Symmetry: D2
Subunit: 224 residues, 4 copies
């Protein structure tokens, strides 16, 4: 795809608040867009050590890094040169709601990301606010074409310190500055993991691998 | 090995309920391959005449015994079949509709008997469901989560519309076995449920389904499944 | 309104299931439709001891009994002779969902109610399934006119044994068999209370008072 | 009858945020009678030109200090003003849209200062909010619930539409006080919030609100409030 090299650089900035607590973050990283892998070194610049689980911000911290087959239009690689944006509502089973908005642009080999986050109504004595989470499980997101843009839906499961799971629903919208050849309905298979965390809980390395594809299960109706 | 579950198993199903003020009954006669993960069901609407709502909203309610499971992942449904198990579900549509369901699964001979109860409300009067503007479900992936000696299954299936778009719903399904069973770790079901035939008289519909259970095939840096 | 006396009788039948548990209930009672008051003696006829709190069934156990002012059309009293029906989704903050459908008809002075209920996804160790509820608080429901029928919305709070509250969102639809005159948007002010429970826990007396009204806070735009 | 709360108070407000990709900023100057439960706010959109979405979805975010409280019900908001308090809200619209908000309230002299932050997403691009076909909010009743040292307020307000119908949303708002405050028992807020004057350029909006707090009007047979 035009102006997308085998290895790309990432610059990220994030600001916002969760349950009365304001914070700011920055990200330095790289990855292989065609191989579908990426890494991000995240420093928390404002708001000290977070009083809530860092995990609830992980989804917000670039679908450019996604392995796409020849047969399926890659919305994200097409949209990058002209720029694109995404917005998300993440609704947790115990009451928490995390809203996010993001702008993505390209300057040379640098993918610059600007994120705004707003979270409210997280149970004060729940796993998120008490920092009793242990990273997300792998998941698969449904990519739905909707009027010029995309709508992505997922039900990711967050691992808990007690050995259980906290689930949330995700609804993500995508809008491109330029007009792009839309894909048919398909899936993203994700695995997002925290590799390293600094002692003071300020610096955290996050990795992600993404494979895009149609369903693996055969059709009786000749459908994808 | 599962002694009572053969290569081919037969299905006897009964459904009763109502959607948007309209009561109905359905019966199902089917067969499947539990280890291949394939099944077929011949559905006849016995009461409530021709349905005033899209049949597609009943399809998920019409048996996870027919799922291809790998050796390394415990099969809850095959383990639970002899003793009997039940499932319950809330399906929440993006435009207001909510469909509730409860089901009991038991085994008599090689016949898997299913008793389903359905209750749907608040579907918009001029929406695609109540105007029958739906064109079957897309394939989907369901997340299988162990909880409290049972299972919690979560999905975001997409329903194809006559206009060429999609109507999405959220599904949350609970599972309870009568006997204590060995619970699997978190994993996935990859599904494709298709109507092979819809009779012209609105009385009969053949429905097929293939299911594959698996962990994520995307590599882990933490050595996680 | 025709065929509606000062005092009317009630006959009710309920069937359904909550969290895998099938049950049946019957109701015998009376009330004053214009005074907006009613009493119902509920006997649990099938399903032995209920494993869930009886409180979650209380809303499903007759809007005919509502004190209506002259300036607001009474949908329920208009619809009663010809018959009307209602359907409801009650979504609890901790995951439980109770679905209901009901038919209302008149035979003489006897209001006949046929209810079916389907409840799922209630947390196994939550206050509902552990029966740690203590009746509902009073509430106020918003009556919204919508295409020949009604949509009613409420956010009722259920009192808990611990002293806190468990809240749910209610969305109730109404359809009349004969076309009636729809009101403008207004409110119901409700108080539904259990007055008595039998020693064998099979019989419970439930009382309800309802007052319909526009908002009592003054308008600057001359709006109701 | 409350410390630091005069019969008339002034309001200084700042708002910044975004709805459906569109960023904006707003300032507000106003006044009201706290004990009478009435207030007015003169709002100017300083950044983001004329909003491409309905102004109505911001109205709730634009001060519960202005609420008529009876003697027997503890006034959380008047108690919490001198030390300062904060609130946060999720507003979920029936057609998909979600508006998240956070706010900080403090007092300097007779000036109630408000810092608001808004984030709205997933509103239907062709829905009444994004196409600006709303006609102000109906009056409503909010449920005040005491919950762990603070408050939980729940509401289902109805937004009037241009076609003559309604668009409803669910409101869940939390309140946290800086200082420890005497909590009330469960009760209700009866609100009416109206736009009085709007400029032709859609930059300046005058908003008025009246609030009456009370227990339920309906008699009890159990002797409860």
């Amino acid at each position: 795809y035009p102006s997308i090299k085998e290895t790309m650089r990432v610059q990220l900035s994030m600001e916002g608040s969760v349950n009365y607590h304001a914070f700011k973050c920055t990200g330095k990283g790289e990855g292989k867009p065609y191989e579908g892998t990426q890494s991000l070194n995240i420093t928390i610049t404002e708001g000290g050590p977070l009083p809530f689980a860092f995990d609830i911000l992980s989804h917000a911290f670039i679908k450019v890094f996604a392995k796409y087959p020849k047969e399926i239009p890659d919305f994200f690689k097409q949209s990058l040169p002209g720029g694109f944006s995404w917005e998300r509502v993440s609704t947790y089973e115990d009451g928490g709601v995390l809203s996010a908005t993001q702008e993505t642009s390209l300057q040379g080999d640098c993918i610059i990301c600007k994120v705004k986050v707003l979270g409210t109504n997280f149970p004060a004595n729940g796993p998120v606010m008490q920092k009793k989470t242990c990273g997300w499980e792998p998941s698969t997101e449904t990519v739905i074409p909707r009027d010029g843009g995309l709508l992505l839906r997922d039900t990711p499961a967050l691992m808990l310190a007690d050995g259980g799971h906290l689930s949330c629903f995700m609804e993500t919208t995508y809008k491109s500055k330029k007009e792009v050849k839309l894909p048919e309905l398909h899936f993203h298979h994700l695995r997002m993991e925290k590799l390293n965390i600094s002692d003071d809980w300020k610096t955290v390395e996050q990795h992600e691998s993404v494979v895009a594809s149609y369903s693996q299960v055969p059709s009786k109706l000749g459908h994808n």
